[PDB]
Amino acid sequence: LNISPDEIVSIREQFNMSRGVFARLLHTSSRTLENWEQGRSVPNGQAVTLLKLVQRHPETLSHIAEL
Amino acid sequence: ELNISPDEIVSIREQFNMSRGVFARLLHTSSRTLENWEQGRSVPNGQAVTLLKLVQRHPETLSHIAEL
DSSP: OOOOHHHHHHHHHHTTOOHHHHHHHTTOOHHHHHHHHTTSSOOOHHHHHHHHHHHHOTHHHHHHHTO | OOOOOHHHHHHHHHHTTOOHHHHHHHTTSOHHHHHHHHHTSSOOOHHHHHHHHHHHHOTHHHHHHHTO
């Protein structure tokens, strides 16, 4: 439903990943993610869903990679 | 770049024996938007496509999503 810029950064920090690496694993551009992390735009509802999914279920990154 | 065809979107939903409205709500979109994706009038945004292919290959994902 909702996720703040600080929370988006924190998800990435669980994985000890740089922005570019995390973005790539989410099939999202680095710059789009930067905009979200920096509070310049809001992610769409499916992106929020995706970030929240990865947060709680880290194995989702691997699933994505194998798509 | 990931892609999912309109027919594939319909098949995923039917596989979940789910109405268009419920599936849409779980994906955080409207039934009207999902209908556009299913009929090929629109293509989902990139994160939407990713979610769809996940739910397609990993069914348990829908359960995870429901509980976020």
